[PDB]
Amino acid sequence: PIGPEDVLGLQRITGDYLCSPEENIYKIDFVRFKIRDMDSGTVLFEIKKPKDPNAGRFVRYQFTPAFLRLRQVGATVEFTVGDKPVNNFRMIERHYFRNQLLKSFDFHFGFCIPSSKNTCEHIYDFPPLSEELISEMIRHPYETQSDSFYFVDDRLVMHNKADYSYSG
C-alpha cells in the first residue's frame, strides 16, 4: 500500500523504487514525450518509441544552463494503456538538488481510454531559483534528480527516476 499522502511530504529522493514493474497492472506505456519552452517554442527534448536494462525506469537529461532560467515548460506525453479501465491516473513528480526539494508537481491525467493511445499535456511552472543554486546546479551535473510517482485510484502503480545535467 502506497498512496499519494506517502509521497507528498518526502524531503529527499528515494533510495530505491517504491514498486516493481509488475505493479503496472494497467499496462501503461509511455511511447512519446516532448518538452518545450512556452516562451520560445524551442523543443528542449523529444523521444519517440521506434542493453540499458533499466531504460524503462531511469532517464538522464542533458540540458543547457539557460534551462534553469525558464519560466514555464510544456510537456506532451503519449501513452498506451491495456484493456482494464484506468480511473484517476495521477503523477506526483518531485525534483531535488542534493536532496533539497526544488518543487513538486501534481498532475492529473484526463480520462484514459482503455486499449488505446492517449495524450496529455503537463505544464511545469518553475520555482524561483537563487543565483547560488543555479550556479551549483550547473557545476554539479546529475545531483539534480526527480522521482515520478504514478497512481491509479490512489494506489502507486509506477515509479520512474530521472537525473539532470545543465552543463550544455
Partner: peptide
C-alpha cells in the same frame, strides 16, 4: 519520468 522508455 514520462521520458523513460524500454
Amino acid at each position: 519520468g514520462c521520458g523513460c522508455s524500454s
